[PDB]
Amino acid sequence: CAPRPDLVRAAMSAMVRETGCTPNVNIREMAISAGVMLTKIRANPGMLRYGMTATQTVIYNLKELFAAHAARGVVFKTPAIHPAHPSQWKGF
Amino acid sequence: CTTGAGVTSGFIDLATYDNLDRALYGGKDATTYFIKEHYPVGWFTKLPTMATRVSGNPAFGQEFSVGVPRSGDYVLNAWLTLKTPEIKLLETNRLGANGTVRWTKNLMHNAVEHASLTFNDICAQQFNTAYLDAWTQFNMCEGKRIGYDNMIGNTSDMTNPTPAQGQDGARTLPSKNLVLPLPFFFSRDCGLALPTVVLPYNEIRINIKLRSLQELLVFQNKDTGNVIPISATDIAGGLADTVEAYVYMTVGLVSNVERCAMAGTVRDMVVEQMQAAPTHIVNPQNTNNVHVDMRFSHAVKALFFMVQNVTYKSVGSNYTCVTPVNGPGNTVMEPAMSVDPIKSASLTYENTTRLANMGVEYYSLVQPWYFSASIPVYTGYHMYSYALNVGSVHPSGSTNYGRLTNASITVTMSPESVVAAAGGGNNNSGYNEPQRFALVVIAVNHNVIRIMNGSMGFPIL
Amino acid sequence: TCTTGAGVTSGFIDLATYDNLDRALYGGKDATTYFIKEHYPVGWFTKLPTM
Amino acid sequence: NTSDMTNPTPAQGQDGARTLPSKNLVLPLPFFFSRDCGLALPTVVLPYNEIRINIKLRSLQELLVFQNKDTGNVIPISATDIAGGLADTVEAYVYMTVGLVSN
Amino acid sequence: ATRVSGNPAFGQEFSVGVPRSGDYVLNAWLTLKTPEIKLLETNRLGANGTV
Amino acid sequence: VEYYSLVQPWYFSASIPVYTGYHMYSYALNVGSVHPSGSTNYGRLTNASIT
Amino acid sequence: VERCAMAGTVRDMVVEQMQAAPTHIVNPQNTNNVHVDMRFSHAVKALFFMV
Amino acid sequence: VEYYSLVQPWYFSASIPVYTGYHMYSYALNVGSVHPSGSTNYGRLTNASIT
Amino acid sequence: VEYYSLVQPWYFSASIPVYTGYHMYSYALNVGSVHPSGSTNYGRLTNASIT
Amino acid sequence: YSRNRGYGDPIRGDLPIVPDDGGWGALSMIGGDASDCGSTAVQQLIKKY
Amino acid sequence: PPPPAPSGMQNAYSTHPDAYRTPLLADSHALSRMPVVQVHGPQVAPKNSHF
Lengths: 92, 461, 51, 103, 51, 51, 51, 51, 51, 49, 51
Description:
This is part of a larger assembly, with 1 copy of chain A, 8 copies of chain B, 1 copy of chain J and 1 copy of chain K.
Chain A: H1 5-18, H2 31-41, H3 54-72
Chain B: H1 9-15, H2 19-24, E1 44-50, E2 63-67, E3 74-83, E4 100-103, E5 113-119, E6 122-127, H3 129-138, H4 145-151, E7 177-181, H5 185-188, E8 194-195, E9 204-209, E10 217-220, E11 245-254, H6 256-262, E12 267-276, E13 280-282, E14 289-294, E15 299-309, E16 325-327, E17 331-333, E18 344-348, E19 353-359, H7 360-371, E20 382-385, E21 399-400, E22 407-412, H8 415-420, E23 437-452, E24 455-457
Antiparallel strand pairs in B: 1-11, 2-9, 3-7, 3-8, 3-11, 4-10, 5-6, 5-9, 12-23, 13-23, 14-22, 15-20, 15-21, 15-23, 16-17, 18-19, 18-22, 23-24
Chain J: H1 36-48
PDB class: viral protein
Keywords: Singapore grouper iridovirus, capsid proteins, viral protein
Entry title: One asymmetric unit of Singapore grouper iridovirus capsid
């Protein structure tokens, strides 16, 4: 259950390489989870991704989880009057 | 004589090499076939879905609207299905024995007009019968022609005249459902689709107005070739104003990472619309040259102009000088004297003849052969395109009419048209009664749609 | 599930059906996506028939 | 389906006594290397493997349709029905297209 | 194509190996000579019979 | 003759003739393609014949 | 204990398989001598031929 | 035919067929033995024929 | 047939047959000569046929 | 989610076998891997007393 | 430039480096199926060696 901040940092870099916001993605209470699921990966073959080792599978799972959370957490700003009003999509 | 023997002549073929071959082939950076590069694509899925009803009622002569459900990332395809009623001509019809009933040619592109797509409460696109006919007759891909003539009608069963019950041919018109794909900007190409996941502020609506069933059925006189409007008592079972119809759409779903990446951004989309000029009544008896002004706004890409015979509202999608009449074998017959009423046409830009008095066969054949995917197989359907490829979604040569002050288009009639305008035709000649003609002009233009703050809009208005 | 109209759930199941072959064929940082068309401007020109 | 093999031929004494002619027919083989030019078999790169194609034909009983003129009943054909007897053997060949590239 | 197993005959299975000595092979087709059919007056269906 | 008539147009052309005759043999993969493809130059080739 | 001990080890086994040659049609009226070519792959152990 | 029918089953098998036909030739000492016996592989061998 | 009947014996044999039949084709300049002459080996030559 | 297909013995967990990347899923009862608390300690207690 | 090189394998290849295509052709025997081609025979012991 040893924390692995390197894995979550690699996931951070992979996210910000293309795009990522991740509001509540703090290294605390997440590095420990990554480490314990790495422990679960180890000493339990038969479910690792093909052609990639335990750490890479862990960071890929973190990729999927962070992408899902960021996709779920999307909001739209409400403007002053309206976004579809004809006064907006025009010269002004 | 199975004396097949060659394995070595390839060596001679490769040995043949000179300056021209060195210039064309060869080189260290030259690409080679038999080796295809693989690049991954996005992970997605698609499936049909039912379009939820929001208002109106499906019936002939009325207009109803259907909303677009907000449950998928992209909406990119729409079609309308409609179940035709049963037609059974009785022996008590007004025409008596000399009376046949048959569905009008091109049953689809009829029973529908002013088909519109509106976002929120602002109209974004609108098309109708003339645009549908011109499109399907000009940029149609081969191989699907039989399929389309099965979906829309003209299946040699709806258009075959059926005599009364007392006659030898008492066959009733079958009640089989038909389908019409709705051509929209997102349906034009896969690259253009509606980002419903990004657009929660706008309510997408599709408004369809069905034509009245009175003029949909064609009531023809077998002998004299006369047409009179149908009535409820004419056919068995009366006339059913209501009809069962549905609208279906295809929705695509993408991965969560892709939608997360694309959320919160501004995108510019280029779309194609149409503008329909008001119809003009043409009387070849009085004058032979008819000039009409064209008023358009955006970058016009093509101009489709036809002259439609409008003697009877029952017959539709007819662009000849003589209405079709019944023939032998209970089949529609095309009278011999039937040619396109247009003889020549020209375009004028404020007393500046851009296009001279070119022949009608020019617009009929030469222009489609060079700047379209197909050549029409029916009389009429004249076009002029400013672009190299009309069907291509990517922009090509075009001229914006906003800056160009109002231009005019002039057409010349034909001796066949001016002789069919008056009556005097014998039986089953189509032009027995005086004929009337109307000019219709359709334009196709480009436009730009911008996405800002989760709502689509026009940056140019 | 809730049946009587389950298109979106079926699409979700299809999306969740992901495996090594699917990872090889699709996905990736450099993988392109459909429903988005890149636009490149062309030259400004015009054409007309000439005797 | 050349509108000649699918046209029924009555018996010799009837009005239609035309004989069904013999002509060679060609069928492309849909394979992954034949689907696209970019997908081609690297024979030079594959010297170890042996590439084989197996084709199973059908008996001539089902290839000929015997139809009743009026009542339209179908019965299996017999060797005595057709003059000269049905031929079990056949002249069938397989052709392939190959290419060569520079050293 | 080099025929190596069996003989072509109706109702039988025959095998052919892909010829070597070519850098690429990208096209294959099969041709065959159909027999000649001649109906007899002594057929089971008699006059009311067609092939 | 059926080879030149059908097989070659089927593979290395965009259409097949609908009239008897019109035999063709093409060195290039696509005849209709304007871009050059496989071909042999007859300038460095001695007199060839067709029988 | 047995399964835990024997797990995670490389196992080698020898098995038997069958190769059935394509069927051949014989007509004794024409000739009484028939030649059939066999094309098998591995170490054949027995051959069974019947008419 | 009596050779394959009787002599081979009597010496290199476990039973003799009680029905006509059923001709066998075994390259191995025992047909039914799981442990391998003398045999030859046709992959390294050229075309073999049976008359 | 007259080629094998007359021309080949006239050039590469010591006699010409006086009876119908007996066609030949020799890879050697002199068939009757015991000394070796032009010849090809079929052991390393893949299957050949005569029609 | 799992390279293997088809669930094994519910009470006897599947042995951990490392898959090969080259080439030329349920919570079992945990009855193996030397279960100290139960099963195994019975023999120790019996041979102690 | 002089006329093309005369036949007899001097015209089966081009001197330019980018297109050589050595006229040697690959074998059709693959590698898995290697015929024994050649074998060795021993001296036969005399029948009357017991004298």
